[PDB]
């Protein structure tokens, strides 16, 4: 109704309550609440794919009880 999991590389699994309507941008906002990480500093990956902030969970065919993978962004020389 529905639940997903976000695995960090620091051996932590975050539980989120979401719905398929939710944009990636909004999922990241929930993560920022529970974790302190500014959404633009978030990289989410599912099934080998980086997830764009504009698209939605439904768009990526992310079913119930799925695990996403989170990473912090590096910005490079700009």
């Amino acid at each position: 109704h529905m639940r997903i999991f976000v695995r960090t590389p620091t051996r932590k699994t975050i539980t989120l309550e979401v719905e398929p309507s939710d944009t990636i941008e909004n999922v990241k906002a929930k993560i920022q609440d529970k974790e302190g990480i500014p959404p633009d500093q978030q990289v989410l990956i599912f099934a080998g794919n980086r997830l764009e902030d504009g698209r939605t969970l439904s768009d990526y065919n992310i079913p119930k009880e799925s695990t996403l993978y989170l990473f912090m962004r590096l910005r490079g020389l700009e």
């Binding site: 960090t8 590389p9 620091t10 051996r11 990289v43 990956i45 599912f46 099934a47 080998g48 980086r50 695990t67 993978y69 990473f71 912090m72 962004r73 590096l74 910005r75 490079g76 020389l77």
Partner: protein, 372 residues
């Protein structure tokens, strides 16, 4: 060995050369809360890497002391798996390996591996240390040495035994092919260990080649670009053939230092609760047990009770929990048939009052393995 390390080391330092035509100082001004990205821009923007060889003058917001702090604080970020450059080598390990998927995580990853190489070479050039644990094959790969079956054992001992079994026995019953299941982001892929691999059967005659290909896949093949970029940055300050006088154990000591916990500093800054005292018997048995364990065990014990493998830069006096300072704490809890318990957010060990030393020792060891 350490005796040979010191002889080689004094020779090593004498051969390192500071060029005469660089500024006499390399200045950095930084904010602790952005230390990674700022050190990265400053150091990766220089036209000439040799200016890194000068005296470091570093300011956040004694210079040798701020430099020490910088090396330490930057190591925590460079060796932070959140960025996806490095990853834990196993679910039950504190050692880091290169993330083969670092590129998906961040497209600029090669530039950061080169940077981390530069900082590592820079530490060594200045006789300082970074702070972190890498898997042993990392250092062998720095030296160009072949990775082998025995190298698997310190990373993944069950897989090591599994491959040793294959080496020592007839593997026909196993029905193995030169295929391997690779897992990335929860998904499983079949990859050929060599061309047409999944249709080549493992036999007594080719199983040595199979084992070698599994080892290359495990540690070498998927991280070459990242490792090569690291080495580019590492050799931008230190010549490779100078580096190669060192073996892989010595190289780790040179770069990342001892890898062990000071039991005395640990003991002399712990707090006891609910009955326990510095001379209480159960406590003396505890610190006697800690003295007798090896590095891997002391580190796993530190991780078990504090949640991390890293000792504070100024030792256990400055240990932190989740809410500011929090000295290491042992408190009496439970009954001697119980295994001890850990509260990591508060650096607290729940330790039953066992009756013998030997019993505390086995129960403490068993609790430690049993945690993940």
């Amino acid at each position: 060995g350490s005796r040979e390390f010191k002889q080689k080391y004094d020779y090593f330092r004498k051969k390192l050369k500071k060029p005469a035509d660089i500024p006499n100082r390399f200045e950095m001004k930084l904010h602790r809360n952005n230390i990674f990205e700022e050190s990265y821009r400053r150091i990766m923007s220089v036209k000439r890497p040799d200016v890194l060889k000068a005296r470091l003058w570093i300011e956040f917001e004694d210079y040798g002391g701020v430099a020490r702090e910088w090396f330490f604080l930057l190591s925590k970020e460079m060796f932070n798996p959140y960025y996806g450059l490095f990853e834990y080598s196993a679910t039950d390990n504190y050692t880091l390996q290169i993330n083969p998927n670092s590129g998906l995580c961040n497209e600029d990853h090669l530039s950061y591996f080169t940077f981390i190489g530069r900082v590592a070479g820079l530490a060594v050039f200045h006789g300082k240390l970074l702070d972190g644990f890498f898997i042993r094959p990392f250092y062998k790969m720095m030296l160009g040495k072949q990775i082998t079956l025995n190298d698997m054992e310190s990373v993944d001992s069950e897989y090591y035994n599994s491959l040793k079994w294959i080496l020592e026995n007839d593997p026909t019953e196993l029905d193995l092919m030169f295929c391997i299941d690779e897992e990335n982001f929860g998904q499983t892929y079949q990859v050929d260990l060599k061309p047409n691999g999944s249709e080549i059967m493992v036999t007594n005659e080719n199983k040595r080649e199979y084992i070698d290909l599994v080892i290359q896949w495990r540690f070498v093949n998927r991280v070459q670009k990242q490792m090569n970029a690291f080495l580019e940055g590492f050799t931008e300050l230190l010549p490779i053939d100078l580096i190669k006088i060192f073996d892989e154990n010595e190289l780790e000591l040179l770069m990342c230092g001892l890898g062990d916990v000071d039991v005395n500093d640990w003991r002399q800054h712990s707090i006891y609760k609910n009955g326990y005292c510095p001379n209480h018997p159960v406590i003396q048995w505890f610190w006697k047990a800690v003295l007798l364990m090896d590095a891997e065990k002391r580190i796993r014990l530190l991780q078990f009770v504090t949640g991390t493998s890293r000792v504070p830069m100024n030792g256990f006096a400055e240990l932190y929990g989740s809410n500011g300072p929090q000295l290491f704490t042992i408190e009496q809890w439970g009954s001697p048939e119980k295994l001890p318990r850990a509260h990591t957010c508060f650096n607290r060990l729940d330790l039953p009052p066992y009756e013998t030393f030997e019993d505390l020792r086995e129960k403490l060891l068993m609790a430690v393995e049993n945690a993940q």
